């Protein structure tokens, strides 16, 4: 009846099980289920995500195992929080994560049982790092053809959700379906430690080891790559001295520059690793 702008509060554990259950099935599409609690119409939260087993029927409404749901909810009853089920999700690793005919064929069953049952799709392929990726879907009611199809009010999260407008074939589903907004709730302490957990890559493994491993190598065979860098000095800069003369012939910039800029400045930043970490030897060797 009443419709208002919707927001999905997600837990980091939910997103982890999302992409983990979707990565283990690549290329094959898997089928999960969404877990959470319905607070009201205009706000919704997914506090947990669990994965359904893969069967021979493929992705289908029959793929959900009832005895698996009974034993899982029993295992959730002995777990700290036994919250009620909400909706379903299925990964689409092989393509642009659009709902198929079987996805709506199970959607009238999930909307039958559960009032909302928001459908979520996730794919690893789109971006390796800096995008939410995933997806969002909700089935609009076909019984609403009488009234208008264009809510909500407080368009803030709506008009901002539509953008990019998500291609054509995806927004070809904007007829009969509509997306839903996703925000990351904190839970700042865990988000901060898990932030540093992946920062162990580019910072250091222990925040000590890996750049003490930079104290292990430490110019060692690292001058071999300086010899290849000084071979990049000779190579790139012997054709860099041909550039300014040619600039005087053609008069002047061909736009350009060749770039052929910066580069070995970073090699000199490794020379800052040379001077610093070797200056540590005076502290290491003496007392």
Partner 1 sequence: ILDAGGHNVTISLQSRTGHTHMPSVVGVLVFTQFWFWFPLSHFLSLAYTPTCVIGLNKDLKMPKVQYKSNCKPSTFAYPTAKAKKKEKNPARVMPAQLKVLTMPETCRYQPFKPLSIGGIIILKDT
**Three-state SS string across 43-96, please?**
EEEEEEEEECCCCCCCCCHHHCCHHHHHHHHHHHHHCCCCCCEEEEECCCCCCC
User: Nearer to partner 1 by C-beta: 159 or 164?
Assistant: 159
167 binds partner 1 per the rule CB under 8 A:
no
**Cβ of 157: how many Cβ atoms within 10 Å?**
15
* Contact range with partner 1 by CB under 8 A, out of 22-30, 107-115, 127-135, 148-156: 148-156
4 binds partner 1 per the rule CB under 8 A:
no
Least distance from C-beta 156 to partner 1, angstroms? 4
User: Nearer to partner 1 by C-beta: 159 or 244?
Assistant: 159
* Contact range with partner 1 by CB under 8 A, out of 133-141, 154-162, 176-184, 222-230: 154-162
Residues 6+ apart with CB under 8 A from 65: 52, 53, 55
Binding partner 1 by CB under 8 A: which of 4, 55, 108, 155?
155
Pairing of strands 32-37, 7-10: unpaired
User: Nearer to Zn ion by C-beta: 6 or 29?
Assistant: 29
Where residue 158 falls (left for φ over 0; alpha for ψ -120 to 50; beta otherwise) is alpha
**Count of positions on this chain that bind Zn ion (CB under 5 A):** 3
Query: Residues 97-136 vs partner 1: string with x where CB under 8 A?
Result: ----------------------------------------
40 annotated among ligand-binding-site residues: no
Q: How far apart are CA 15 and CA 5, in angstroms?
A: 22
Q: In this structure, are residues 50 and 17 in contact, taking their beta carbons and an 8 Å threshold? A: yes
Binding partner 1 by CB under 8 A: which of 143, 154, 251, 275?
154
156 binds partner 1 per the rule CB under 8 A:
yes
149 annotated among ligand-binding-site residues: no
Binding Zn ion by CB under 5 A: which of 5, 10, 14, 59?
59
Residue in 116, 123, 44, 122 with CA at minimum distance from that of residue 87: 116
Q: How far apart are CA 213 and CA 207, in angstroms?
A: 11
User: Nearer to Zn ion by C-beta: 100 or 162?
Assistant: 100
Least distance from C-beta 35 to Zn ion, angstroms? 20
From residue 174, give the alpha-carbon distance in Å to each of 6, 74, 158. 16, 37, 13
Q: Specify which residues 119 forms β-bridges with.
A: 137
Residue whose C-beta lies closest to Zn ion:
59
Q: Using CB under 5 A as the criterion, which residues of the chain lie in contact with Zn ion when the complex forms? A: 29, 59, 100
Q: Using CB under 8 A as the criterion, which residues of the chain lie in contact with partner 1 when the complex forms? A: 153-156, 159
User: Binding site residues, as ranges?
Assistant: 90, 92, 103
User: Binding site residues for Zn(2+), as ranges?
Assistant: 90, 92, 103
């Amino acid at each position: 009846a009443v419709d208002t702008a919707e927001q999905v509060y997600i837990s980091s554990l939910a997103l982890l099980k999302m992409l983990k259950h979707g990565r283990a099935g690549v290329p094959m599409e898997v089928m999960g289920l969404m877990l959470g609690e319905f607070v009201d119409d205009y706000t919704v939260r997914v506090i947990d995500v669990f994965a359904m087993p893969q069967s021979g029927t493929g992705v289908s409404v029959e793929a959900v195992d009832p005895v698996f749901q009974a034993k899982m909810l029993d295992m959730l009853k002995q777990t700290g929080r036994p919250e009620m089920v909400v909706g379903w999700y299925h990964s689409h690793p092989g393509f642009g994560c659009w709902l198929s005919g079987v996805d709506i064929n199970t959607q009238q069953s999930f909307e039958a049982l559960s009032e909302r049952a928001v459908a979520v799709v996730v794919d690893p392929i789109q971006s390796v790092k800096g995008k939410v990726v995933i997806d969002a879907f909700r089935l609009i009611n076909a019984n609403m053809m009488v009234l208008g199809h264009e809510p909500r009010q407080t368009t803030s999260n709506l008009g901002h959700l539509n953008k990019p407008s998500i291609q054509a074939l995806i927004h070809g589903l904007n007829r009969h379906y509509y997306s839903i907004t996703i925000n990351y709730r904190k839970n700042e302490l865990e988000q901060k430690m898990l932030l540093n957990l992946h920062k162990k890559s580019w910072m250091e493994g222990l925040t000590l080891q890996d750049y003490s491993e930079h104290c292990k190598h430490n110019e060692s065979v690292v001058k071999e790559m300086l010899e290849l860098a000084k071979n990049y000095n000779k190579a790139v800069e012997e054709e860099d001295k041909m550039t300014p003369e040619q600039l005087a012939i053609k008069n002047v910039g061909k736009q350009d520059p060749k770039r052929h800029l910066e580069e070995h400045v970073d090699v000199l930043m490794t020379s800052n690793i040379v001077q610093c970490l070797a200056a540590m030897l005076d502290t290491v060797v003496f007392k």
